Amino acid sequence: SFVEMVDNLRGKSGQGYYVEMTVGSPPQTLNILVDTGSSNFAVGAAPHPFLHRYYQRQLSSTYRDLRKGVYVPYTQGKWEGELGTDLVSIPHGPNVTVRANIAAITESDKFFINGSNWEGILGLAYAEIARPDDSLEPFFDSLVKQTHVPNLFSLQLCGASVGGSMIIGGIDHSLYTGSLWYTPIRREWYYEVIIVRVEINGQDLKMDCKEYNYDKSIVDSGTTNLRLPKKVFEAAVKSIKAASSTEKFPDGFWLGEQLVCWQAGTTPWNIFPVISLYLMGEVTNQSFRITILPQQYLRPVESQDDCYKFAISQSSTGTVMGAVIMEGFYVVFDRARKRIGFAVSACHVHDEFRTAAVEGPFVTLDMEDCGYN
Ligand SMILES: CC(C)[C@H](NC(=O)[C@H](C)C[C@H](O)[C@H](COCc1cc(F)cc(F)c1)NC(=O)c1cc(C(=O)N[C@H](C)c2ccccc2)cc(N(C)S(C)(=O)=O)c1)C(=O)NCc1ccccc1
Numbered sequence: 001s002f003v004e005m006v007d008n009l010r011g012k013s014g015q016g017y018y019v020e021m022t023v024g025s026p027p028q029t030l031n032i033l034v035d036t037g038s039s040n041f042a043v044g045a046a047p048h049p050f051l052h053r054y055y056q057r058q059l060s061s062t063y064r065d066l067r068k069g070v071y072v073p074y075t076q077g078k079w080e081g082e083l084g085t086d087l088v089s090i091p092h093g094p095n096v097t098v099r100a101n102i103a104a105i106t107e108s109d110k111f112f113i114n115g116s117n118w119e120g121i122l123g124l125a126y127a128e129i130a131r132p133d134d135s136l137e138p139f140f141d142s143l144v145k146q147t148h149v150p151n152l153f154s155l156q157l158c159g160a161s162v163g164g165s166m167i168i169g170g171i172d173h174s175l176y177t178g179s180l181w182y183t184p185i186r187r188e189w190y191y192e193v194i195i196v197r198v199e200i201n202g203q204d205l206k207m208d209c210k211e212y213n214y215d216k217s218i219v220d221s222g223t224t225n226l227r228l229p230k231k232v233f234e235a236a237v238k239s240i241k242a243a244s245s246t247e248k249f250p251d252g253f254w255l256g257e258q259l260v261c262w263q264a265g266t267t268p269w270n271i272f273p274v275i276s277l278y279l280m281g282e283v284t285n286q287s288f289r290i291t292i293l294p295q296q297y298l299r300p301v302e303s304q305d306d307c308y309k310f311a312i313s314q315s316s317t318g319t320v321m322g323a324v325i326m327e328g329f330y331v332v333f334d335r336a337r338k339r340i341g342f343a344v345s346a347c348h349v350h351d352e353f354r355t356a357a358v359e360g361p362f363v364t365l366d367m368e369d370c371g372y373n
Helices: 139-146 209-213 230-243
Strands: 009-011 018-023 028-035 041-044 064-074 077-089 098-109 120-123 153-158 162-168 176-184 195-200 217-219 226-229 260-263 275-280 286-292 298-300 305-310 312-315 319-321 329-334 339-345 357-363
Touching: 018 120, 028 041, 041 077, 064 098, 098 139, 176 275, 176 286, 176 329, 176 357, 195 209, 195 230, 195 286, 209 230, 226 230, 230 312, 339 357
Parallel strands: 028 120, 041 098, 217 319, 226 312
Antiparallel strands: 009 018, 009 162, 018 028, 018 077, 041 120, 064 077, 077 098, 153 162, 153 329, 176 339, 195 275, 226 319, 260 305, 275 286, 286 357, 298 305, 329 339
């Protein structure tokens, strides 16, 4: 039932959203980072200074060794480990047990985060980007094939320490407002989508829309920032720079390298532009927009000052719509229908005079031109 899953995510601010799970017999309780940018289910199986518990394969009567090794690199860190299957369930999720692939993590490099409170990762993207190859069934596929849980999940990530909901197997209407707008998943590997226009405070950025998806645009609950290709990152920074030139910033701030602060309660939100991403819609020549507030891309970092880090950053692997984008929104991963839906969420962040928004329809000729091949 849906209400039982509402508020099943937690997290320390800047440190990820995790859901509670159990692996084994008898069940061992672990916190798992919820990650739509990858496809491997993996937990700490070995003492690590940043970890407070870990999976112990020898305490489980249902563990099965797979006698195959694995390694998974992310933008920001990596780990290797030993594959195997075991029984798994989600306390605050659907009321089932499945046998799934689990990577037992034995060494890692900049992957676990100090004091984050999660010991593992749930990659919810598709088989094709699974390691070591697409034959390792991802958790969610196993979940669907072995139960009657419909092939769909939704994420409401609340920022504003950090909380939210993962509704597994449907949509809870009491968590968003207005209507859901859908964008096709272009290809089932990452959650790849096509961005057809970008505006900053109502001004078209006027780049060739191939640039917005060079070389892909993905939706990713595992990455903090809105990450943009070099060309797009530079046009954006130049605009945001010019809209808030009223104020004083060391330019390593623009690079995410230092903070800016303000006498508490005086942050000048008004000089930071709203950003609109226009996504491919579901019908010919049709798109829609989602608009984020500066409260989403200036993240409060923990004096009686308010300090913020700039959370838009460069990438050479295409656009990443990370938690900065997703925290405004109720995001539906309709795998069954190959689409991703957005609505303003209930826990939306609050400007005095401006609102995070999902709006349509819009006309956009030549949307197919926008995909990079
Ligand atoms: C297996 C495959 C699908 C893999 N997937 C990915 O890399 C996707 C895009 C990234 C994942 O979402 C991956 C999974 O998240 C786990 C993680 C947490 C870490 F602290 C460190 C890590 F290394 C990893 N996330 C990140 O790489 C990542 C995490 C963070 C980050 O801070 N994440 C935390 C947990 C967080 C905080 C708040 C909200 C959500 C998440 C930040 C970044 N940035 C780059 S940034 C500064 O925001 O621009 C990236 C991939 O594509 N690899 C390609 C590759 C190969 C070799 C080398 C580099 C890249």
